[model samples]
Target chain A: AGQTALSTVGQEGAGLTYRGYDVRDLAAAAIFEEVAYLLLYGELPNKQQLDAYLKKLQGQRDLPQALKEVLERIPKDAHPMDVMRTGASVLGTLEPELSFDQQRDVADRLLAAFPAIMTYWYRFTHEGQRIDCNSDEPTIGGHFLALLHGKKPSELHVKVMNVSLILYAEHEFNASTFTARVCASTLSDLYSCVTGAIGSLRGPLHGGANEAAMELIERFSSPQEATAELLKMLERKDKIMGFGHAIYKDSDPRNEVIKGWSKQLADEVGDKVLFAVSEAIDKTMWEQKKLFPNADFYHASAYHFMGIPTKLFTPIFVCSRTSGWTAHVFEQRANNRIIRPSAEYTGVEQRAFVPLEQR
Target chain B: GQTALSTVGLTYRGYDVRDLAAAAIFEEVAYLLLYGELPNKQQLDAYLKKLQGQRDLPQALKEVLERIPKDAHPMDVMRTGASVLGTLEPELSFDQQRDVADRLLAAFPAIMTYWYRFTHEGQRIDCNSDEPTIGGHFLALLHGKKPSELHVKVMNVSLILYAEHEFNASTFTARVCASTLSDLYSCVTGAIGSLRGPLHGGANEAAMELIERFSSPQEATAELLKMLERKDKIMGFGHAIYKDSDPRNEVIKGWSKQLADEVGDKVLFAVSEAIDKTMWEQKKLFPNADFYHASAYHFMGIPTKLFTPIFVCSRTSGWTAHVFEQRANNRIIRPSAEYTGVEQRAFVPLEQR
Candidate 1:
């Protein structure tokens, strides 16, 4: 029995809601920390609470020394997901959860530390310098952008990053969240659950969609080129990324919100051609194949316009989705079962053992 | 709609598990799992050489392991070791599947025992053992002396038995990770986390804890009956898939008996058998693979906590095999959940709360 009060999806007219609050409202009015606090605490934080939460998060941003050493050892060309996975694992070893009571502290630590983990590995391996992970910006979105570029992000960039983080803050029982829940059901530690969820999200069909989307969108310079290439891919029966989704059959509700930001960012950056190509692919897919753009589709242009590398796109997804995963972990522990299911045996029947020499 | 207990009589790729355990070496089973067929003599020799060549851990990795706390779980050690190794010697391309698989297969024994020896024994024992097989190498490293022939044979059998099981929680977890096309280390690290749960591979250590609580069969029977009456969950007496008995249980139990007889430790083995007999008679519950493995490994001088790490060392073969299979025909293993929750509620303003 899969039941969750954390979020709701595909309920007639209701697009998506995180704990009774609509994602649209959250995306519009709330920052990433607000959504994260709401998801973890089950209610939106007031001004005093939000301020205190932001400070707490900021204080948790520094990576432990040993963990940084571990990050230093990670290869430069390694997938950012691996970097995050290993970073989280090492953190767990250093500061393990002593009890379920420490779950909230650990969740907040991960939320605060993920951007540090990502940018630290990125800078150390790529630039061969170790930058301080601390940031003056209060919000996680702003902090990530600040640490990533070594400069404070523009207002538009920060606003779009916050909105994107809010939109991706939670999805009800998606693959990664489900993986986390399954892991937590076994009474495994919180890090194990989140690490498994990261692995699940690293799949191309999940968090990797934006990177895949960016790759597809970057292939053409104009709408006509994109349309021709899209049609050829459809002819070849090749699956398009960031197109149809498992949930939200008619459309992904978060798509329009991010797509709006993508278009706005494209206008701000004076890269309207890429926007036109993306729209052309969207139109072609919708008109020719009846597939709608999911959230990851326009996130490509939005992140690219912000000067973020394609490889780091999914790790940003990880930064936000960790909230939902840990929330599910807590919920599963509150009422847990070993999430072991059965599999059909279609292999050989009972067979006698034969000597290897006889074979 | 598949059950975890789909196959009752255990078989791996058409080979009876008992036969494989009896005849094949751990490297042969590793080859079978990785390559999809049992290796001939030449293939086996080549595979062994390849694995032997990769057995040494990087100096950086050992230092990283040295930083881990002594009380840290060995499975966590194994998981972190794999993750760190991926960063150092990454799968630069998916074409390096065989190379990556062999690297982990050889490195896991070294990783597990390195942390184990340094933490527990206060001596940084050298991991470069000349032992020709994975089982022997592990035994040699764990103890500072080469293992006897019988000890090596038992270790080999144990690894082969734990080498593979189809779609168990950890293997399925690995497959789920691999389905994302994540790197091999990430997939295996995730699986290690899944297996760390007391409900899964942790059952072996938990079983040992339960068995060690009593000094005699009479004491075990009385205490176990009381535990049953209180409805406390007992570890290692039942299987998710097997109804009356586990297929691997009998085989492992046979080894446990031999080891007990060899060590002349009649009390522990007798207590275990008494618990088994009591559970079977009282609850109709039979032992699974983890039950007998407790006394057997204990007899071989393995620490109780290291039981699950050994499981990881053996099951890495199965995990890598499933990883290769998952990457071959990858699909996002996302299944729909039957959502059961409240209807849409209006958003309350933050001030109202």
Candidate 2:
């Protein structure tokens, strides 16, 4: 069995904690870099490790020439997930270092390059300009904003993105990463494993929920319009996006941190209307369904301020979460199980096929 | 409304499975499963003809098959072949791919069997047939000509039985790819890979080994009892969703008897029945579809070696149909998992490892 015994949330329903730290605490206090380190090495990196890791991360930021060429050629309107999956596979061919020994390094390179890979293609195809991924920002957050916006991010914006990265880094038993680990349990290649993950994450129930939430927010021009729309949605028994958590019932601890940032960014941008719009919708969802917003609630405004495209939001989540996916991939390989199960045979036993001409 | 689709537990779609044990022919069951009624003369003839015509592999698909490595895993071969078919004829129109789906269902056995026998047996298995049924054509080619009437009947029943099972890992994986609005090939490829697991379509091979371990029925029972005492996994005894008897068992059991009667060789049949009885006695678990299938397929001279690959050939039909359905109703199959791992870990330097 390739699965590791480092952690178990048995088939019985249980709360999730990572490496002795609750997800709520990690979401609140840790930055993305610290979370990525925790996942990769199995403990939070000390100051020296963080310093070298950041430097190493900085050095691996360059994109390969072939990926850049491929990025330039894709159609502008292609789904970002499609582009990202194809781009990752394209990286597989160029590097050829995806053998077993180099898996962790390959994962790191992908983590470092995904933002560049995504933003480069994004800017090149949409804006018709090359992105400078070589921004000398000390953090992934600063660099991602600089590359996307074509300029340095304000300190506050960078901090918000950094925290957003941490928030998006990992969740237990999510479809895409679990799907990835399932594929990897079969000893599949890294590209195929991650490709499976991308497919799973693109669905509305997972990473897509965040982007879907943002779209819901933007559809209404005012808080009154939003409240009425949300009320109608609730009446129709529609599950409002960003309002419910599978694990947390009362509140999402991550929301409080991001909500604080969302407010600060709202004040900084002088956009009281959008802040009011989000708050009213949040209150309406809670009052009606007793469902509270997740990290995605504030992310709608946070991403808006960063000028990140709606389409890129989920793929950006995918990029940040790759570290966690790789960590689970490593774990699954350590304690492997052939996860095969039988189905209730519901179809007819045997029948002769009908010829097409007569039909 | 009887079944909530989201329930992640055992749920049957409602069919009396014991009738499968009683059916005299494989086509009878296929008719029941597909159109939900027993076939009459006209229905049987038309169904056989439709399946017959579909067996001829398309020229592009043949070329794709030829290009796959002769030594590649059969699952990978099917995956690559399916993907290539999608590329050559993208399923841009739903109906176009639906037709391809039927063709794939019909031709997969012929294609896989033909290539396998040619490479391994050094015999050119015929692809065309004047047989009365799709299963008959498979046995004819596999045996280098038309097989005995009983042999064809057994093979027919086997395919009909193997045709479909809902939302198994491979079938569900196919839907996952289809949910992305990807082409038919992607879904099929994903299914093939998922089906390769020993826990999925590969269970028949595991069952064969389990049965072959003992020399006599009594000895087999004793060994099985020991394993049961130790709580070892008996591959073909239990199912994920079927807590009771497998519905297809009786259908195949009937065919198995017919084949046994025709050949007058009951040793393999006896062994399978004994194993089923022993399993029940030990664990109160009934034999699954793969249990009797391996024995029946064996007595038919289906090379014990090509057992699970035969499963790939048959299940491709069900997989394709599900892929098309998932695409039509498309919702990405993403669910959330509770994260349980290291929260803040340092990256180990390469030297540390």
| Model 2 ranges with Cα > 4 A deviation | A1-16, A24-29, A351-359, B1-169, B175-317, B324-353
10 residues in a row with least lDDT, candidate 2 chain B: B1-10
Judging by DockQ against the true structure, name the best candidate: 1
Cα misplacement distance, residue B121 of candidate 2 (Å): 28
Model 1 is docked with a DockQ of 0.47
For model 2, state the Cα shift of residue A273 in Å. 1.2
DockQ (Cα-based) for each candidate: 0.47, 0.08
* TM-score (chain A only) for the predictions, listed in order: 0.97, 0.91
Task: Give the alpha carbon lDDT tens digit for every residue of A1-359 in model 1.
Answer: 35677888877766888877778878887788888888788778888998899889989999988888878877788889888988888899899997989999999999999999999999999999899999888788999999999998899999999999999888876668877877776688999999889878876656687898899999897899999988999999998988987768788889989998888899898996789999999999989989999888999999999999999998999998998899888888887743445445544454554444544
Candidate 2 iRMS, in Å? 8.5
